[PDB]
Short mmCIF file of C-alpha atoms and ligand atoms in Angstrom, two decimals:
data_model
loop_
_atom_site.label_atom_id
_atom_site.label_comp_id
_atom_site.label_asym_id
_atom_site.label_seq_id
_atom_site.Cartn_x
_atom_site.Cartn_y
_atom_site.Cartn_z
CA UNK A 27 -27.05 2.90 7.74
CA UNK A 28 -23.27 2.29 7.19
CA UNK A 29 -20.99 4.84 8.96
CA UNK A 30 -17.72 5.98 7.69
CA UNK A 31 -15.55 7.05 10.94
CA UNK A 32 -12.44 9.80 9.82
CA UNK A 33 -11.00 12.58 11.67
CA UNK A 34 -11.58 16.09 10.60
CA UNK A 35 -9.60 16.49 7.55
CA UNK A 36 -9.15 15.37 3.69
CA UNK A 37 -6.51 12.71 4.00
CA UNK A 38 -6.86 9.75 3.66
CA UNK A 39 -10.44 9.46 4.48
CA UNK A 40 -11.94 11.77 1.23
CA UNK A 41 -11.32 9.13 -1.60
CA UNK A 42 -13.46 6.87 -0.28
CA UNK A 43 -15.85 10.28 0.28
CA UNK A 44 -15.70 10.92 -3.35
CA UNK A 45 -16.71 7.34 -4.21
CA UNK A 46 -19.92 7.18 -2.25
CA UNK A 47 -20.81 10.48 -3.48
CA UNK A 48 -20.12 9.01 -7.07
CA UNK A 49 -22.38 5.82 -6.53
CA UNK A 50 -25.31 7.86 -4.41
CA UNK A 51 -24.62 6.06 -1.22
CA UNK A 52 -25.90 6.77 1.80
CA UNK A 53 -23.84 6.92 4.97
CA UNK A 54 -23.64 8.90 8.05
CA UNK A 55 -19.83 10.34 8.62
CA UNK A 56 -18.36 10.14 12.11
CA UNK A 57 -15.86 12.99 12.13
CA UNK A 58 -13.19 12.82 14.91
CA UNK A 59 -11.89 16.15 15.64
CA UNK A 60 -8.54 16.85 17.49
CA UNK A 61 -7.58 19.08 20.75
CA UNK A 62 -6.43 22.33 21.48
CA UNK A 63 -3.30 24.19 20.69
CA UNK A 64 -0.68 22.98 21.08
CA UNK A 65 -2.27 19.84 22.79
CA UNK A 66 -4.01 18.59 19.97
CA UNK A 67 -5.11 15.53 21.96
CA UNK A 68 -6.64 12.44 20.01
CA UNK A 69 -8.93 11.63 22.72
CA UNK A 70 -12.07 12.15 20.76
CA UNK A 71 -10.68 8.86 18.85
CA UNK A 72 -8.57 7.22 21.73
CA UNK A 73 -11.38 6.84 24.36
CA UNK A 74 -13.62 5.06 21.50
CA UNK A 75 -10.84 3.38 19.20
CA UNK A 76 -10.60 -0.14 21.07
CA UNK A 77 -14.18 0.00 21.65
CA UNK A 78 -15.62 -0.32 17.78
CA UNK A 79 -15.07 -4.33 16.99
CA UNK A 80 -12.37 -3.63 14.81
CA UNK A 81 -9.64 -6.12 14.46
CA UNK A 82 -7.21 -3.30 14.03
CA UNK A 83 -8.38 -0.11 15.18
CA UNK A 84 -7.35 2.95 12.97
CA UNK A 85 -8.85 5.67 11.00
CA UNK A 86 -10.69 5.56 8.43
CA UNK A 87 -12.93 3.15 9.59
CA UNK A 88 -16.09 1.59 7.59
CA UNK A 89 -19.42 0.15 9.18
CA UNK A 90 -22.04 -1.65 8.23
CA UNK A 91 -24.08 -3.71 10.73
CA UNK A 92 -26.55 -4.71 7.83
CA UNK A 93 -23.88 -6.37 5.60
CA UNK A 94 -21.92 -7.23 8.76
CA UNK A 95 -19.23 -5.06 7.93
CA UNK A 96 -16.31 -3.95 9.93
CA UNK A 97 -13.60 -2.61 8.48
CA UNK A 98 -9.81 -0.24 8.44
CA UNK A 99 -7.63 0.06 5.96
CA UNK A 100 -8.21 2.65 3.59
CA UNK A 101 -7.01 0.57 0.11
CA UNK A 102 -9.10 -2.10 1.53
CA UNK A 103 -12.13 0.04 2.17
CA UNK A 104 -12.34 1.44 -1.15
CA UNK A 105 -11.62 -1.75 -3.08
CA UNK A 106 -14.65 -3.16 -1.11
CA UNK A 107 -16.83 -0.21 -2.31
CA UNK A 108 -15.57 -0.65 -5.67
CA UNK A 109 -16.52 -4.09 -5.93
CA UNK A 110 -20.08 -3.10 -4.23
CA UNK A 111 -20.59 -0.64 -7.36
CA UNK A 112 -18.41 -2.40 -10.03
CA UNK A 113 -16.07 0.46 -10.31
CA UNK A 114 -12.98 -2.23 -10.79
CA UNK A 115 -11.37 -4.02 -13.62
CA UNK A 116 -13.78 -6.36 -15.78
CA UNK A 117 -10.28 -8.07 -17.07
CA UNK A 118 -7.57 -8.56 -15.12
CA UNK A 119 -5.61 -6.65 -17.94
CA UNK A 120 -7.45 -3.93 -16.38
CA UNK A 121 -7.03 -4.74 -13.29
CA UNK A 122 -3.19 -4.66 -13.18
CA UNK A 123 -3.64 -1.36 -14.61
CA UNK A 124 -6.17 -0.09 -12.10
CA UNK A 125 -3.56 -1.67 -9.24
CA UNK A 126 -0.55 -0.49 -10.40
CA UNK A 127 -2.12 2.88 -10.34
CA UNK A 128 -3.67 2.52 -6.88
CA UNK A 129 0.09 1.94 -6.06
CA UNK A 130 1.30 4.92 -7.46
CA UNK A 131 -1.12 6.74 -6.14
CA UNK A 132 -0.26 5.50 -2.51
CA UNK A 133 3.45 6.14 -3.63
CA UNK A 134 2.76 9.86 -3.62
CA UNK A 135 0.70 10.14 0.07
CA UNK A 136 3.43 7.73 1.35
CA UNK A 137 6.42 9.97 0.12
CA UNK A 138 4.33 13.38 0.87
CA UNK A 139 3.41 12.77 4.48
CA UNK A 140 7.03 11.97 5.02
CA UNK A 141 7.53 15.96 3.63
CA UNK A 142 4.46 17.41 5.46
CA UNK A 143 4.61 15.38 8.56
CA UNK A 144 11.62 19.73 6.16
CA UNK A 145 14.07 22.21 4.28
CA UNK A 146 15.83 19.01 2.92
CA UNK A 147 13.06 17.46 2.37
CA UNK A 148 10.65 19.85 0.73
CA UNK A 149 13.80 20.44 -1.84
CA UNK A 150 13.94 16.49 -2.08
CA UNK A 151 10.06 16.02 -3.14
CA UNK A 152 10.45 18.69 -5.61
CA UNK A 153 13.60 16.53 -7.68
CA UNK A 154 10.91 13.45 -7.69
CA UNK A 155 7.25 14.63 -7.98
CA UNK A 156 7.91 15.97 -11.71
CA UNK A 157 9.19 12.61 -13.30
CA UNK A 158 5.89 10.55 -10.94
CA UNK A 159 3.98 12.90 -12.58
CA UNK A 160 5.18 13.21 -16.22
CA UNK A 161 4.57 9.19 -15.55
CA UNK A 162 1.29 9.14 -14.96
CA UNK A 163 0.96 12.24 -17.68
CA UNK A 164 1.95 9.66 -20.46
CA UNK A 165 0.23 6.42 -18.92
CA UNK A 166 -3.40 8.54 -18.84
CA UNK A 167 -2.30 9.47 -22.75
CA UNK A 168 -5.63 10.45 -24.07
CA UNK A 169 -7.99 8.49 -22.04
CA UNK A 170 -10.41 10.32 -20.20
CA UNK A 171 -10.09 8.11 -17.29
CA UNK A 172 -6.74 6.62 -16.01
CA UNK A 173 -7.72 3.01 -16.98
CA UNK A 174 -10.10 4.71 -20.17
CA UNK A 175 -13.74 5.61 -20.69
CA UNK A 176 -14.82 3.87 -17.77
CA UNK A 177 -14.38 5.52 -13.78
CA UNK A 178 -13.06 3.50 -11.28
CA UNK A 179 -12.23 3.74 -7.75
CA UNK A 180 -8.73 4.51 -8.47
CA UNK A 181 -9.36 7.76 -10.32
CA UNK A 182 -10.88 9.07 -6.93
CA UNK A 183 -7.67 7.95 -4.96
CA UNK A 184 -5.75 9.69 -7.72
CA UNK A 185 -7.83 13.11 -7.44
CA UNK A 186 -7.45 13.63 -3.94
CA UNK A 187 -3.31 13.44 -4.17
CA UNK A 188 -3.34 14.98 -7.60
CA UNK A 189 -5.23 18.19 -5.60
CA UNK A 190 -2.93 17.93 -2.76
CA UNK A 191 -0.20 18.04 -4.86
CA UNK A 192 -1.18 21.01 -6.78
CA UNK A 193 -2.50 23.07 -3.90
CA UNK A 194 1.27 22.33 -2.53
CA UNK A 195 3.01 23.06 -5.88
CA UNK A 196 1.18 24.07 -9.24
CA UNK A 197 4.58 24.39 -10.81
CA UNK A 198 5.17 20.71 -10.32
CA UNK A 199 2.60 19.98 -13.34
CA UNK A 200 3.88 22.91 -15.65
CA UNK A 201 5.26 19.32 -17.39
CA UNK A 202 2.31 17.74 -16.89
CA UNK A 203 -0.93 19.56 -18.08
CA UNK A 204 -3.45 16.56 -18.94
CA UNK A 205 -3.56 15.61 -15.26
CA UNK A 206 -4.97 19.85 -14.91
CA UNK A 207 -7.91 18.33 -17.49
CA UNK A 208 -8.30 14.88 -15.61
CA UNK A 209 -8.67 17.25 -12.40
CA UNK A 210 -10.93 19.14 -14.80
CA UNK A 211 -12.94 16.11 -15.85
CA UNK A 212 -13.29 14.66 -12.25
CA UNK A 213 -14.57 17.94 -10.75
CA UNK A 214 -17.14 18.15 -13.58
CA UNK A 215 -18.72 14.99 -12.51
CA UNK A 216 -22.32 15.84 -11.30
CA UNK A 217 -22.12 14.25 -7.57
CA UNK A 218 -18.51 15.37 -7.40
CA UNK A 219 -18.95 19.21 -8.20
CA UNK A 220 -21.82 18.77 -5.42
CA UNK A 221 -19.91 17.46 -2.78
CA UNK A 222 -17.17 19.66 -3.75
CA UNK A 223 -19.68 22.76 -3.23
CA UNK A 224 -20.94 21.25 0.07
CA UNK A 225 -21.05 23.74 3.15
CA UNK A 226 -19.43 21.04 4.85
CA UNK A 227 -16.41 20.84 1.85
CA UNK A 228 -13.21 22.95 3.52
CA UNK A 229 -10.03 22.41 1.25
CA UNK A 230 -7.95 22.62 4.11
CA UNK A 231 -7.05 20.74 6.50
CA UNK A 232 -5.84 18.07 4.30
CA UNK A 233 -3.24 16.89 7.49
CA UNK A 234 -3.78 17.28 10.97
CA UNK A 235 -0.99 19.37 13.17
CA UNK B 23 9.40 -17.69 -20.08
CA UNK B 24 8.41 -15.17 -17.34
CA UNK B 25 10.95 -12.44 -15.61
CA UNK B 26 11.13 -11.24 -12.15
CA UNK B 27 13.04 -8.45 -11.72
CA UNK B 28 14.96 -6.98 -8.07
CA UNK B 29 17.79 -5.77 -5.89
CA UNK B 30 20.28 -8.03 -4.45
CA UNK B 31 18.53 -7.39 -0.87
CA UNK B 32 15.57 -9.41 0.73
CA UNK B 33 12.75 -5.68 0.81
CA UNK B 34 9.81 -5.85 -1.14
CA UNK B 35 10.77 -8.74 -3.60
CA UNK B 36 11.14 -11.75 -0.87
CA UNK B 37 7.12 -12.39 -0.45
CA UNK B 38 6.75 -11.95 -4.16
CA UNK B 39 9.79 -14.64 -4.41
CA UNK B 40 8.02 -16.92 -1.67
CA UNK B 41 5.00 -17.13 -3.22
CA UNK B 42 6.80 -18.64 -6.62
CA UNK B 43 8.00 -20.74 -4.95
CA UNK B 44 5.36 -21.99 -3.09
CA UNK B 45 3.40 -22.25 -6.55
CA UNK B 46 6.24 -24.10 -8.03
CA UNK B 47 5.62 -21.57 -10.81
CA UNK B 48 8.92 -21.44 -13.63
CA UNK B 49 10.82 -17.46 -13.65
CA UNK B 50 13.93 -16.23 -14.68
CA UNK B 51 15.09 -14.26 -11.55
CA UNK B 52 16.83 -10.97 -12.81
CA UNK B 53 18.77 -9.60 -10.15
CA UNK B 54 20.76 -6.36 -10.30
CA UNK B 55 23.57 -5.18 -7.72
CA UNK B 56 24.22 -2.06 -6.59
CA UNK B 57 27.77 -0.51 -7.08
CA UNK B 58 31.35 -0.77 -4.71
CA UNK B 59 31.21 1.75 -1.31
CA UNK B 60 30.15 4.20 -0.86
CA UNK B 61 28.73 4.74 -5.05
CA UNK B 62 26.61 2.19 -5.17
CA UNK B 63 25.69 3.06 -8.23
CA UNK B 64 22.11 1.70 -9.49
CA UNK B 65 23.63 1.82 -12.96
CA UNK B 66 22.62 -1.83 -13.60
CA UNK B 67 19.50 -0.89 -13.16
CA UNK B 68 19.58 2.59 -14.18
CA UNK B 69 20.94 1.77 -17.83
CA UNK B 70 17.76 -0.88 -18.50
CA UNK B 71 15.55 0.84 -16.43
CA UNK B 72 13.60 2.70 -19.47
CA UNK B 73 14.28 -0.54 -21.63
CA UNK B 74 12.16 -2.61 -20.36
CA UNK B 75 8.99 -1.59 -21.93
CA UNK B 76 7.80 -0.45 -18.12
CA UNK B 77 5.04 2.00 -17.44
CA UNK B 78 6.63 3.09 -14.26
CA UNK B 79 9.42 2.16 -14.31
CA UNK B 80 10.77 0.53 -11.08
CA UNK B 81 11.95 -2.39 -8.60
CA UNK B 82 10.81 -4.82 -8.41
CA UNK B 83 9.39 -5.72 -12.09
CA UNK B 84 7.38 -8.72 -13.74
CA UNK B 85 7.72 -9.73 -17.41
CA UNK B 86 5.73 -12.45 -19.49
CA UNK B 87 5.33 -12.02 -22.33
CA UNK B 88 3.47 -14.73 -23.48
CA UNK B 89 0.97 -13.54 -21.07
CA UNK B 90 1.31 -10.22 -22.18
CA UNK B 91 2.19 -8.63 -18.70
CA UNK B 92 4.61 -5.82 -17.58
CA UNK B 93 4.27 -4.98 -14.37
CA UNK B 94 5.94 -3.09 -11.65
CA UNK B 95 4.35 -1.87 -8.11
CA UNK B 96 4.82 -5.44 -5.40
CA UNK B 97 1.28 -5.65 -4.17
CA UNK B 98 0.26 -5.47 -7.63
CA UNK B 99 2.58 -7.80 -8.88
CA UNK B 100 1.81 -10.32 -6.02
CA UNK B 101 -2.13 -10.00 -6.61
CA UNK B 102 -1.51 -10.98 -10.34
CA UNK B 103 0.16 -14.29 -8.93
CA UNK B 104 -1.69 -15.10 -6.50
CA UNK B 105 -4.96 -14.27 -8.97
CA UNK B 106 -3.55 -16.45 -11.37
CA UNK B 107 -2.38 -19.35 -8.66
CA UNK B 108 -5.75 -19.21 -6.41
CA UNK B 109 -3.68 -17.45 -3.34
CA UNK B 110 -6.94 -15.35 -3.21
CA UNK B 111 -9.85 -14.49 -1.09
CA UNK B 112 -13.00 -17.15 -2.22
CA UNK B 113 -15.71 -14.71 -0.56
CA UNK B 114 -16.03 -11.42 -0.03
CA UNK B 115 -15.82 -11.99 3.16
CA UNK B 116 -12.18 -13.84 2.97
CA UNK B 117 -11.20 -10.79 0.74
CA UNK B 118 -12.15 -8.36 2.90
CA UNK B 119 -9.47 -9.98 5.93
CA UNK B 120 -7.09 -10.30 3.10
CA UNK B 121 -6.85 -7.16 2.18
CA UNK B 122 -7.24 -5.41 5.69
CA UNK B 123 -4.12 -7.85 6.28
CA UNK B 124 -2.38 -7.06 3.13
CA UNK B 125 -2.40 -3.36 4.17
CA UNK B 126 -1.70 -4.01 7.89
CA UNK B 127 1.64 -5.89 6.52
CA UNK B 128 2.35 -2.65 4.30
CA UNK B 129 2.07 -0.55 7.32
CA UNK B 130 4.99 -1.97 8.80
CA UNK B 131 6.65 -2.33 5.64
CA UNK B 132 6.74 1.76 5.14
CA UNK B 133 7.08 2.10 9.08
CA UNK B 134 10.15 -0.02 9.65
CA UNK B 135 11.67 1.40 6.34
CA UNK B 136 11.28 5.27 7.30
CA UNK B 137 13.06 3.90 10.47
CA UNK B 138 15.89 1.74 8.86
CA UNK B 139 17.24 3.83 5.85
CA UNK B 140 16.75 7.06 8.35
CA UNK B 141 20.61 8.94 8.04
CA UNK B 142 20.54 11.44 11.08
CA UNK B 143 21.66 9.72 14.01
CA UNK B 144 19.02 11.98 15.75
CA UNK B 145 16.08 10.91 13.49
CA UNK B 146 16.94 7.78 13.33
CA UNK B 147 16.87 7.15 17.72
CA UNK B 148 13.79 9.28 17.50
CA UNK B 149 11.81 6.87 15.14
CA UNK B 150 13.02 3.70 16.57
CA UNK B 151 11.86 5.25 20.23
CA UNK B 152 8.89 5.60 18.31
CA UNK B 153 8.71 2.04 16.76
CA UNK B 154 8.79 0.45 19.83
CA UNK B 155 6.03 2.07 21.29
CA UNK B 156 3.61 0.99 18.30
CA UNK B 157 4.65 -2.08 17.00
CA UNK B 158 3.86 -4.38 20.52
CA UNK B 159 0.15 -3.15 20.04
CA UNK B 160 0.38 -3.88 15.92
CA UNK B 161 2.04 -7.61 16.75
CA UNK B 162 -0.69 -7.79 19.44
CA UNK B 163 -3.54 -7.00 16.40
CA UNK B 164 -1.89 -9.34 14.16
CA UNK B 165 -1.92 -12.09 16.76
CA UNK B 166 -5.25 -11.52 17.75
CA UNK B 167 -6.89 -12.18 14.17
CA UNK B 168 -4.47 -15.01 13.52
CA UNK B 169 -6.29 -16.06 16.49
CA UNK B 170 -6.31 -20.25 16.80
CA UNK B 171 -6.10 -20.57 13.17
CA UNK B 172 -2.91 -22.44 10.66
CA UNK B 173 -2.63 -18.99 8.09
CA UNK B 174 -3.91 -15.90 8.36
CA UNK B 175 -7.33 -16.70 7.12
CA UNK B 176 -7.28 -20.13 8.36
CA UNK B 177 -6.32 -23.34 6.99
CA UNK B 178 -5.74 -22.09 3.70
CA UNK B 179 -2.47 -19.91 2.40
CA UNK B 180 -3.23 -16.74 0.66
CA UNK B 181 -0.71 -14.57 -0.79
CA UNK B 182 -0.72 -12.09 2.43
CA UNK B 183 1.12 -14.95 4.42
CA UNK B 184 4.30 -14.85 2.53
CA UNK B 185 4.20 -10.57 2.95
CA UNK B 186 3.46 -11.47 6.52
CA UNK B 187 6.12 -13.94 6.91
CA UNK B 188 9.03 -11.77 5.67
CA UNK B 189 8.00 -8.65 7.35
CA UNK B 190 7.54 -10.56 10.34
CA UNK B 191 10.84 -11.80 9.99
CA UNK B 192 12.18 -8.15 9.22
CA UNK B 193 10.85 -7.34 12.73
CA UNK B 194 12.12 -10.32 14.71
CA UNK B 195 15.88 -9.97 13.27
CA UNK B 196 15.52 -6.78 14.11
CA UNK B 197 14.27 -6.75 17.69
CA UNK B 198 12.96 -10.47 18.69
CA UNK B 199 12.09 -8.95 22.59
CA UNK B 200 9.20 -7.68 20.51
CA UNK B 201 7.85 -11.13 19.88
CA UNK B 202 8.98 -12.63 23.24
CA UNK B 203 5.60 -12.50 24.31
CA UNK B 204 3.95 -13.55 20.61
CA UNK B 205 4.39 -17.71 20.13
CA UNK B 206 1.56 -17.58 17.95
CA UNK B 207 3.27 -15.17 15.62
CA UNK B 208 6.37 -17.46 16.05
CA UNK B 209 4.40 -20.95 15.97
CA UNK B 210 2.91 -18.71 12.76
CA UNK B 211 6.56 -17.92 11.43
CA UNK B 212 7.88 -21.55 11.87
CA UNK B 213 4.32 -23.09 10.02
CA UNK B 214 5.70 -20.88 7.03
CA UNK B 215 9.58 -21.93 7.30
CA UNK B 216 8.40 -26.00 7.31
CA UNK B 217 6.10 -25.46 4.23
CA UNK B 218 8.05 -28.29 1.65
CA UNK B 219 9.61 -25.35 -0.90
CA UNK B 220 10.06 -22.21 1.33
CA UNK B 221 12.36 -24.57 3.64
CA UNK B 222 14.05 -25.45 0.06
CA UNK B 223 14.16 -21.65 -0.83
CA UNK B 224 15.09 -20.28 2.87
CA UNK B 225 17.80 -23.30 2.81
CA UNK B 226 19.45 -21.92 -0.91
CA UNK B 227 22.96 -21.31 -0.94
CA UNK B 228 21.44 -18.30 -2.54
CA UNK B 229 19.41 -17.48 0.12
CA UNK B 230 21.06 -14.68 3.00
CA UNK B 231 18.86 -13.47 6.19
CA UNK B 232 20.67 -10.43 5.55
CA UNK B 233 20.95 -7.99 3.42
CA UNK B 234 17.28 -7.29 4.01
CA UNK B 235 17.58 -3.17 3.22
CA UNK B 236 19.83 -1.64 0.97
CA UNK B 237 23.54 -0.11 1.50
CA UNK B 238 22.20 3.22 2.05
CA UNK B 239 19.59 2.28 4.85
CA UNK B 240 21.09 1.90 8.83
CA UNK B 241 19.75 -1.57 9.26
CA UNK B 242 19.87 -4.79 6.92
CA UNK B 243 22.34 -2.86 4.79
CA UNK B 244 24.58 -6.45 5.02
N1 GSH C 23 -2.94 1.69 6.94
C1 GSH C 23 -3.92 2.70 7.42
C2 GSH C 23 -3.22 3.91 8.04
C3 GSH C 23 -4.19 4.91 8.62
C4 GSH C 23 -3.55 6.09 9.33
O1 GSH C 23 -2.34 6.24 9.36
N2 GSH C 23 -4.39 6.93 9.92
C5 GSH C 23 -3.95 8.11 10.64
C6 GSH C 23 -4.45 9.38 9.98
S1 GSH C 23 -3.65 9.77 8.40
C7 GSH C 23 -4.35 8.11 12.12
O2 GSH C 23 -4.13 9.11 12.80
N3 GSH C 23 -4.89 7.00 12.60
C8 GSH C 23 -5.33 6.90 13.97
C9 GSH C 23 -4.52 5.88 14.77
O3 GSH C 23 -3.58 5.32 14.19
O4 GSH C 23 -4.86 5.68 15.95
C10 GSH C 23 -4.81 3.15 6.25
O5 GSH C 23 -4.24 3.48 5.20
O6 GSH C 23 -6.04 3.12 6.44
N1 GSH C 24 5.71 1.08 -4.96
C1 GSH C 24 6.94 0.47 -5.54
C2 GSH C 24 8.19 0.96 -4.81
C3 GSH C 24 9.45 0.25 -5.27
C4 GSH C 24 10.71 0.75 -4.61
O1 GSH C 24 10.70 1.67 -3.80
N2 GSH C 24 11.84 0.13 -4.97
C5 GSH C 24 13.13 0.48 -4.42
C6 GSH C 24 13.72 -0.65 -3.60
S1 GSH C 24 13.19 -0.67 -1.87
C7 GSH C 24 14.15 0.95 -5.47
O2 GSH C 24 15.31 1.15 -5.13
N3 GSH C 24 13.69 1.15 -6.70
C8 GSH C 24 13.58 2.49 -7.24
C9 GSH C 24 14.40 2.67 -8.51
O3 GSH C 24 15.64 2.53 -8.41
O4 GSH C 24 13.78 2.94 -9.56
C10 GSH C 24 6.84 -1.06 -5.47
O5 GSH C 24 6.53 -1.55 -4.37
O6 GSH C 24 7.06 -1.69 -6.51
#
């Protein structure tokens, strides 16, 4: 069966999560988990991460011996899914959309684990977020997906930093409400809202220490 | 007739303007410059910026509208031309390297960057300590999957070899004892440079190795 290696958090890793929830597919999940306080030693990952036939060893990592998979890059393991379960463009007037989007989206992670990985900088997100957000507010309009009726993998992405956001800063979509009722809409979706109300499912840790 | 939009500075736009070039594809190239020391002011850009019928507004920007396309966001931008120009991956298989290699190349892109327009002196010694420490093992990665092989996916140029080229290039101007040890990636780098209309476009009077960042940013400010 394929494996999906992470560490212990949300990050990066729980888009990708999302999407194999939302297709029904089976893998197992090789969680990585840190060290103690205030070690927090990466061992668990370091001893094995040369060691996995990847041609650049990072997490998240995806395998599939069957397909003769091996794969990093989290954009370029969810694109690969998405093709497997057609949840990209069927135009490439979509698909600009959908990628313009994915870049957004990465905009956000990139320019929040530069605040969570910060007095200056905390005050510095909070100037920027709003106007990235009232963005996406007006490009979603009244679809009920970001690219329209149709889900694809870029809606996950855009959950998982939409929720990261908000569990940072609600205020920062007081201008913004339809993203709440995207949130809304994802959360509703039947494999989502089980995975969501896993055992296993712990809000935090998003980022490591 | 189509409109590519950027700073004055090498960044994100160069691989974007490579690839053009390459294609032999006709654009109007927009540039905007930032204002005198120490404003700077991005009102060029700031003054069209919500004119421009833009989504998300931002640099760099792609207009044809005979196609029908406004677009912002580079790797977006650069997977619509290299779509439309056959810079792609063939097989699942090709795409798969392509885009592990496309997002390999970002990585360095947002590394170096965090690094280069860093202000505190402090912050700024502390990240490049840090650089050097992770990018021998990254140019060691990039090497090994280049492996024996003309491009990064083998004989054939996709679009990821002109965002590995300039970042590449980013690096080497910036500390070349990294790739002392990496003739491959500089055999790889020259293969690039001798291709008929990137030698035309690195040998521009337009052209400048520097400024590479922006005015703001420590390194390849000018
Ligand atoms: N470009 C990679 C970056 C992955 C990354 O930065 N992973 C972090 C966790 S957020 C990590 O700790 N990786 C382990 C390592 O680099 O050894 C991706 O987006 O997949
Ligand atoms: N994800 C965007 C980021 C673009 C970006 O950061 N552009 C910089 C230049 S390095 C800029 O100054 N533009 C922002 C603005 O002035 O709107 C892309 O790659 O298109």
């Amino acid at each position: 069966a394929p494996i999906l290696g992470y560490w212990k958090l949300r990050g990066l890793g729980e888009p990708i999560r999302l999407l194999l929830a939302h297709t029904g597919q089976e893998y197992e999940m090789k969680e990585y988990s840190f060290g103690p306080e205030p070690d927090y030693d990466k061992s668990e990952w370091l001893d094995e991460k040369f060691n996995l036939g990847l041609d650049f060893p990072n997490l998240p990592y995806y395998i599939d011996e069957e397909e003769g998979v091996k794969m990093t890059q989290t954009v370029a393991i969810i694109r690969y899914l998405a093709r497997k379960h057609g949840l990209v463009g069927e135009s490439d007037e979509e698909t600009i959309k959908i990628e313009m989007v994915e870049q957004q989206a990465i905009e956000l992670i990139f320019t929040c684990t530069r605040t969570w990985y910060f007095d200056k900088l905390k005050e510095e997100m909070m100037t920027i977020l709003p106007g990235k957000l009232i963005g996406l507010a007006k490009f979603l309009g009244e679809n009920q997906y970001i690219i329209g009726d149709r889900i694809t993998y870029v809606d996950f992405m855009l959950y998982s930093i939409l929720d990261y956001i908000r569990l940072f800063e609600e205020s920062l979509f007081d201008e913004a409400s339809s993203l709440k009722d995207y949130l809304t809409r994802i959360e509703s979706l039947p494999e989502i809202e089980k995975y969501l109300s896993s055992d296993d499912f712990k809000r935090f840790p998003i980022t490591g220490p």
